[PDB]
Amino acid sequence: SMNFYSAYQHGFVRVAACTHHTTIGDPAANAASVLDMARACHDDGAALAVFPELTLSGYSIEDVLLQDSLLDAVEDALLDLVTESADLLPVLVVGAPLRHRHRIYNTAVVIHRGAVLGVVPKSYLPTYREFYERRQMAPGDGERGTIRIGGADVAFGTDLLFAASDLPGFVLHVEIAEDMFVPMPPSAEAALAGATVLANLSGSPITIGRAEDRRLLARSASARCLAAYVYAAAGEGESTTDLAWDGQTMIWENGALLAESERFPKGVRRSVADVDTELLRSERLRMGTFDDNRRHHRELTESFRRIDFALDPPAGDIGLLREVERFPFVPADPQRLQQDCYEAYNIQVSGLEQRLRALDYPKVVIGVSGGLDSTHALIVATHAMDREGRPRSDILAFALPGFKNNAIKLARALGVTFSEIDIGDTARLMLHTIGHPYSVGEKVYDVTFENVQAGLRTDYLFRIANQRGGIVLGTGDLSELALGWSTYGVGDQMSHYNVNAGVPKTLIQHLIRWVISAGEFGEKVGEVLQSVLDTEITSEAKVGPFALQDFSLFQVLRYGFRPSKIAFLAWHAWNDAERGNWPPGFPKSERPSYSLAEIRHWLQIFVQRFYSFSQFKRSALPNGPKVSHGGALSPRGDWRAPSDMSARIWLDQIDREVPKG
Amino acid sequence: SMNFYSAYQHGFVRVAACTHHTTIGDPAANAASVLDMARACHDDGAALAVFPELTLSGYSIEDVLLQDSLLDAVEDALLDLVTESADLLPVLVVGAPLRHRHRIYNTAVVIHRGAVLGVVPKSYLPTYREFYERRQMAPGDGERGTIRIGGADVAFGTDLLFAASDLPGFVLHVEIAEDMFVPMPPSAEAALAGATVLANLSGSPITIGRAEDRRLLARSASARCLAAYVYAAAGEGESTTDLAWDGQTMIWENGALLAESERFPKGVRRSVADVDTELLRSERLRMGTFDDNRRHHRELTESFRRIDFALDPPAGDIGLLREVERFPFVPADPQRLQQDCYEAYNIQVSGLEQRLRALDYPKVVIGVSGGLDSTHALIVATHAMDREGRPRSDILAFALPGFKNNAIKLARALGVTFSEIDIGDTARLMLHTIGHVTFENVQAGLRTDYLFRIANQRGGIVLGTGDLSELALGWSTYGVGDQMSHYNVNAGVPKTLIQHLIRWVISAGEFGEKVGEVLQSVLDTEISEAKVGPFALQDFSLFQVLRYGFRPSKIAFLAWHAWNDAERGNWPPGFPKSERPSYSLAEIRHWLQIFVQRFYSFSQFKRSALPNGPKVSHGGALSPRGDWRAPSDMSARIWLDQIDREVPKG
Amino acid sequence: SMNFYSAYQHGFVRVAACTHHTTIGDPAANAASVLDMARACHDDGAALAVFPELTLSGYSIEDVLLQDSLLDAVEDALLDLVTESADLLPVLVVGAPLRHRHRIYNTAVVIHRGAVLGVVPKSYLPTYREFYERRQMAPGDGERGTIRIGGADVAFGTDLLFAASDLPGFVLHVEIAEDMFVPMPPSAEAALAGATVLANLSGSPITIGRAEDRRLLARSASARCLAAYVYAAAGEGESTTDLAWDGQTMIWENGALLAESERFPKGVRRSVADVDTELLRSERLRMGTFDDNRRHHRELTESFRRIDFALDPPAGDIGLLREVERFPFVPADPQRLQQD
Ligand SMILES: Nc1ncnc2c1ncn2[C@@H]1O[C@H](COP(=O)(O)OP(=O)(O)OC[C@H]2O[C@@H]([n+]3cccc(C(=O)O)c3)[C@H](O)[C@@H]2O)[C@@H](O)[C@H]1O
Ligand SMILES: Nc1ncnc2c1ncn2[C@@H]1O[C@H](COP(=O)(O)OP(=O)(O)OC[C@H]2O[C@@H]([n+]3cccc(C(=O)O)c3)[C@H](O)[C@@H]2O)[C@@H](O)[C@H]1O
Ligand SMILES: Nc1ncnc2c1ncn2[C@@H]1O[C@H](COP(=O)(O)CP(=O)(O)OP(=O)(O)O)[C@@H](O)[C@H]1O
Ligand SMILES: Nc1ncnc2c1ncn2[C@@H]1O[C@H](COP(=O)(O)CP(=O)(O)OP(=O)(O)O)[C@@H](O)[C@H]1O
Fold first, then answer.
1. Would you say the CB of residue B492 lies under 6 angstroms from ligand 1?
2. Which residues does the UniProt record annotate as the domain CN hydrolase (chain A)?
């Protein structure tokens, strides 16, 4: 049914910030540069194209703004653009000095498919330092009503919203340069009122440090207002009588930079990006204090006039102009990954420090198997003990062989108290007592077989902890919590405190890597740790590759995206190993590509297990700290959900919407 | 420091609804009856005394209301009352027809220590059926400003609140009769504005079914408005030209009847009760939607004028005019207890029914020891399975001897699948392997270990059996132990109620005579508290904390008044007189120290990782996903210190 | 005439963001950690000392916030602080859950020289993801009037300004955590109204990426509002039942970071910096569109209640807690100089 490969059908909207070639005092020329750029935008299937402040006249022409011949030329040019726009897909937002009542206003003219939808005047006009705007032009704040343009009356003022009737995630608001720099910018009221994509036309003569100012204010705006912020500044061609221009364009989404263009270009430049309207939708649905703010400023926010237009965007495959990282929990950029690891580790450590202080420094009891999770937790434990001036011998590490050598090597190198307890006999006794086929020689490696052993490990650890005055450290990770890959209750799901509960599996390996690199525990410890990595990396058979499951988990836990949307995203991230970026630590022989067919398959498994099967294991969860901004799975925190629900609707959405391959 | 035995110092406020002797047309007489009744109220240490509609004139005198000599006499009487009040403790709320601007209003005059604090006019004046009030008197809704009374200007209107400066829990609002009968009564606005005690002066000629109307409206008002509602109607002495009068008085608190007086009495009557202002405070602190409602009507609610007075109540022991039941979770009244039991049981059962349906009808695995909790759970399980048309043999009951016979008897009688597994050897093996209290724990844990493994093996879920009182006190073996399970039908039922639920199941007689006999034996046989105190006291403290969050000294005061004397108050059914203990302050204090330490500090972590199961009691349950969100790593120092400082040692 | 070497006489005001040692559920303890830190601030000649969200109770105690004994203890502790403050120089801004009308509000109590100047309730209470604030506490937005505290009626609400009568460059406004995260934060109205130093008490359980969020919003706030922004988050001692805490403190001025403290410290930490009130004064005098914005929201901005206090700061040499670069046109940092 749905065209699976169409960005528009998954709730993206393609936006462009353009910097044209200014020809000061020559509107026909500026209009020509605009028309050519708008045609490119059309070709790219964009829905929106934002130009620089006072586009049609040039921002820097000062008193030439007041010349009748200039103002008349601007009108002529604007009407031709409007006429050409009948054949263009995107809504064009073009700057122009325009006559209304007594004066000329610094306006942005919102143009679409042959009509002017609205005209929006700058609200705050800088008249200080290099800025003289109040000399030529009038403030817009507080103007309402209509304005006459090519024999039509069209909405005029600071209170406008342009809403796409066939694309509700897309609601446009426009402001101009200085507007975003004052304590209470028009766009903040607009977002509370329903605007999701905020436009800014800017002239912005460039100086040292100013591009940082622009980024600080556009970025913070996108974040605080849970919105896209689309920004375009003037460039080559503006007068250099007292100023220079850099042509900067940028597109922001909720704090993140989607795109930006070359500063000081030779020639016109565009930023083109696919904004995820569902991402904005999801952020807002969850952050009730955003709506609370709206209600507080109800009078302000209900006064907006909503102007409708029908975008009717391209239905087909037009790619996805957006960076989709393979590991939502593991940034590919090394500066950022280093930071994330630093914070994850310190979260884990100090979380445990406080549990320890509160229990007047119990011993720490932990099962160590030489695998990734328990290795990392033993490290966390040791650091906590160190920072609290506790002897490392109060950490009681246990190997619990059933029916590798890294575990004792690590424990000996850290200098914790090591000990082995073979649970085989306890296991045989229990298997025979409940009458299981293995006790009678049959090779039935059941779920009860695997479970009796798993259970007996936790049983032992808990009893030792009662006996020796300790608490049992859990080692289960978030990806395990997500998928119900735990032995519930009497088993590895259960513990006194779980330092790993909020760390997804894809991040664990990078936390260990990080501890080695800090080099804090010395060379001997680093070598064992390194061996753990090398050994353990090279279950996954039943629940899928954790890379794919960690990807779906982030989408669901943070945004609640529907399955078809998660598949579209994962595919764009994973299907081609040569595209996008890998974090550090992925030798090229461990850089897999997944097909739609696979991504689909693992996702069916994921929704069934996450939404339905596994919640009961999460429901009775031991304490432990949240780590990732994506969320954690504590039924006391980020995820409150029924333990007895079917996942039918998610599975059915996959049947209907995701192609088989 | 605190006088522990003083109701006032524990945040009670003593209120009185009075019905005097009406002498129609004779204000001096009415004032005399009022002054005598006000003096009783004073002697009783009351803070408030509410009289009937139009007290000083008589409500029923019709056009006699418009006679100058009558209105003049009313004023003379009112002024003497005010003068006498200089020596009286309670705020007096006295009815009177009063001249203002063009007309007479139907007013209540709020009088205190020599001064008139305010004058409040009836808002809605019935003029239909037996009622002709708009013929003589003016509506007060919308009137503001002041009124001149004995040469002083005093607040006048529907927007008044009288707040005790030295007793913030006590904020009075007054309305009159009909006022509480309209879709949007003045008292509802007042409560949103801060009023905690709502007064109603009423004339209210009596007819068949009218007392029920008054109860329905006063009671629902007190509940919706999280308030005391204090009500007084006219009695003997009003004219019987076309009507009769019953003199009813009543005092309500958040839906509950605190007190009421004899209908159709010969002579004057009072209702006197201690309202718990902390209770109201607690209810409102918790129900945010109450404040939300206030904010939505902000204009309405901020317009109130708050008038201050200093009550300066008695500091000493004046007893407690309030019924404090011994078992907050177990009503002493048999009708009500039967109802609670019926509800609790059906909650447990249908909670488990849904788990089973969702898991496509797994077997139910349960450890049965022949004690109260597991017995009851097995019963619940059987019913659930019955209602879902599941064979009882899918219930796998297990005796798990360590290092009684009721258990197998019960299981055989119900016809579930019974089985014994001796865990002693598995225990010995484990104790030896770790090189061995932890003794009691190894066994407790191995039971749960086995149950879980059997459930994996035989396709079942393990039923928990831990009760709420065990959850409250941390009397569980955590994680690998009896705290852990796949679904816990008992988690929300406190121990004091368990025995009554069983008693109930016998009395319904639903499972037959043979089963009833075993169940009965479980009761007789089984009826820990060694280390954590009598569950009766701990269930008392639990309800106080979990519902109202009362401070320890306040919990001790309440528990003492309920428990210290076995002959006072009422016992629920099923307490033979040899099992009817009295506790001293010293004991109640002792167990409470244990309680706060264990509840606030030690035990939360066990509650934090709690299996699913249904909330049962209005008092609350202890799910960290529901009624109780709290830190697992907190000290209880401040509660223990509050006991040191405020509760006497004996 | 002027003491040339006195930071105060050249229009600086010394501010502190403090992270104390939380003892959940123990107000006397929290008060003790506060008093000790406030005394340090006094010794340092600070005019202002901002503590973490819900200081006196601990931010993370959830339903324990609703327990009578806890609320009573908070009151007792608050009054002792107020009494001790008679001998302290700086205005103290201390967090506390406080009873008013029907509920408890998440408040910051502005305390100075023996008196409470005002009580300020959080406006927006997060009830999503890890946040459950609306379960225990009431929203402050729109509350006005007074509140009774130790037998005095003091201003209550979101519309307060505390102005130093002898130091006009210093006009304080207080908000709380989430307040600065919404599209139209209380502090932006406050700055238009005349606030120059914006305080934020925060609990802010820490996660990956959150310190960046805090910096983005505090920094942009300081810049757009031409103001100092003084920020303090909870640290060691808050419950780690589901969350960790990092104790971050920071002081911002018009986009620039004046000071910040160690993240995840062992022990209490302070950020102490000299804010240049003349710098803020000058920025505002020149940027007329700031005042234009105020005029546009005239109704909003004139409704603020201005509460006066006399700081009477130290007249002598107390150094200058501020980085003053030798070459205003040539940044000393190489990354930044390369960019310039
Ligand atoms: N909704 C619900 N509410 C309450 N109880 C529910 C339930 N659904 C199933 N149950 C019950 O819970 C039990 C099923 O859960 P459980 O027995 O824990 O486990 P289950 O999912 O049946 O099997 C556990 C599997 O997880 C894997 N595992 C185990 C241990 C460690 C790791 C690791 O690498 O970290 C992986 C291992 O392959 C094993 O086969 C059954 O007794 C079932 O009747
Ligand atoms: N705040 C905290 N956060 C995380 N972990 C904490 C902790 N405090 C203790 N711990 C740890 O938890 C363990 C202590 O808890 P737990 O293992 O439950 O043991 P605990 O409560 O000390 O022992 C249970 C008591 O209850 C009795 N019991 C046992 C079995 C059934 C029943 C019954 O009638 O229902 C009664 C038994 O005789 C024993 O005296 C220790 O290992 C301790 O170090
Ligand atoms: N042989 C063994 N010795 C000690 N502890 C063991 C153990 N096998 C399992 N455990 C405990 O049970 C937990 C889960 O066991 P497994 O499912 O086998 C994961 P793993 O493959 O051991 O590596 P991991 O530590 O990266 O999870 C471990 O983290 C460990 O604490
Ligand atoms: N000997 C035994 N055989 C089978 N199950 C047992 C058992 N002892 C304890 N259990 C199970 O473990 C739970 C907790 O143990 P206890 O509280 O010590 C039992 P109790 O108080 O004797 O009976 P009760 O649980 O019915 O009140 C019981 O509810 C029961 O389900």
1. no
2. 13-277
